[PDB]
Amino acid sequence: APSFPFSRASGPEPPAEFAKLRATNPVSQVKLFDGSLAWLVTKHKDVCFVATSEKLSKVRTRQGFPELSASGKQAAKAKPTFVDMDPPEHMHQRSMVEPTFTPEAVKNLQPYIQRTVDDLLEQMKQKGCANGPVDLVKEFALPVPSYIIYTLLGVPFNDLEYLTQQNAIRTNGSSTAREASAANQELLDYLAILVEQRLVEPKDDIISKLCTEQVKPGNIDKSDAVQIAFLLLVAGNATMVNMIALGVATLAQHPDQLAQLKANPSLAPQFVEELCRYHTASALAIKRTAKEDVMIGDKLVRANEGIIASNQSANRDEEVFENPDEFNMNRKWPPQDPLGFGFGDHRCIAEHLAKAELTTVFSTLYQKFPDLKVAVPLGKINYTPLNRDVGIVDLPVIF
Ligand code: HEM
């Protein structure tokens, strides 16, 4: 049994193991950091099965749950939020914050998403690059998702810049464990104050909705509200930042497609669809433990055994996506859903918001800066460590 997680084949590539497994051993056992074994599912059909099977559980207190790191095992001891719940607890809590994320709500949020992106681009423009390249991540990829989620949660405008930086410290590879935890606790402390404030004078934000609709009636307590808000903040922010950076690098990598997008920003939606399939920046989030024996392919997964379903591998499944390793914004899509945002009841609560943010970014970025260029050889791009989810740490650009 090979050690898992696997390392990316290269900066922008998925682990080399997946293609081989899909072809010769689609359901196999891997060895986790603690020596425990877990089942790795690599084919699209099987990943979808794992994502929806009622015989599987997301509860982390079940022995056999596939924790991939030492820190992961420790976090599993805290009270859980809906991300780690099974029905009926799952939807009971998730439905408390879903309203803001519905397709309809996101459609109505479009003008706000657009102005947020416009303002950040204008700021990046006036900041210019006369004295050299600027870091697209720091100046744009990071603040876009950050300002939007913080604003939705209820953070006032003047606190956005500082809070965006602190949340980034949580996941920056450079941060020491102390700095990372300090930033973590600080954000939690801050949200605690927001909850107290909104309980007294509710405003138009997620935190206020939680306070008025759930805390006051006694459905959840103040700390629960803080944790739910915290989950919404940290769940996908870093992923969003990476997706934006990865999108820019990919366009640089394939000049012809950037030409097409520039000539027709209306292609943004399809470019984003291909991007979320090709670059599956969240690939270790579909995990379960079998509540009872379950057969998957030619294997029997016994009760209490763990399962990791790779949506990254599923997104490269040649049986579903023709020429899977080819990035093609004009790809002819099959009826099967690409899995960048997961599948089933737990499917990313912010999928529509995330896609709206990316679509807005890629339908505007090159309109603002038609000559935007990565200021370093693409082969020199600073990607996230190979033993982590795909992403980009910094991206120098000129325009
Ligand atoms: C492009 C960026 C994003 C990607 C690629 C992404 C991907 C995912 C994936 C793979 C999952 C697992 C779904 C499953 O269990 O099947 C997920 C869950 C989740 N995501 Fe995202 N996400 C993104 C952005 C966001 C944002 C912006 C937020 C917060 C506003 C967010 C909040 C969540 C939450 C709370 C969950 C847990 C949902 C549940 O278990 O019910 N995501 N996301």
CATH number at residue 370: 1.10.630.10
Ligand 1 site residues (CB inside 6 A) read 51, 82-83, 94, 145, 149, 231-232, 235-236, 239-240, 243, 276, 281-282, 285-286, 311, 340-344, 346-350, 353-354
Q: Can the peptide bond before residue 385 be classed as cis, meaning omega within 30 degrees of 0?
A: no
Non-local (6+) Cβ contacts of 134 within 8 A are: 124, 127, 128, 396, 397, 398
If we measure between CA atoms, which residue out of 164, 153, 157, 232 comes closest to residue 193? 153
Tell me phi and psi for residue 299, to 5 degrees.
-115, 150
Strand 392-394 and strand 37-41: the pairing is unpaired
Paired tokens of 35? 């020596």
Q: Does 211 carry a binding-site annotation?
A: no
**236 CA to centre of ligand 1 in angstroms:** 6
Distance of CA 200 to the CA centre of its chain: 33
**Measured between alpha carbons, how far is 397 from 9 in angstroms, rounded to an integer?**
25
**354 CA to centre of ligand 1 in angstroms:** 9
Check if 119 is active-site: no
Paired tokens of 202? 């509710």
**361 CA to centre of ligand 1 in angstroms:** 19
Q: How many domains does the chain have?
A: 1
Selected catalytic residue, list 146, 171, 239, 310: 239
Residue 312, amino acid: Q
Q: Can the peptide bond before residue 5 be classed as cis, meaning omega within 30 degrees of 0?
A: yes
Q: Which atom of ligand 1 is found nearest the CA of 355?
A: 1
Non-local (6+) Cβ contacts of 385 within 8 A are: 173
Residue 98: give the domain boundaries: 1-399
Q: Is 147 left (phi over 0), alpha (psi -120 to 50) or beta?
A: alpha
Distance of CA 298 to the CA centre of its chain: 31
Q: Which atom of ligand 1 is found nearest the CA of 283?
A: 10
- How large is the greatest C-alpha to C-alpha distance in the chain, in angstroms? 63
Decide if 294 contacts 39 (C-beta within 8 A). Answer: no
Paired tokens of 392? 């980009």
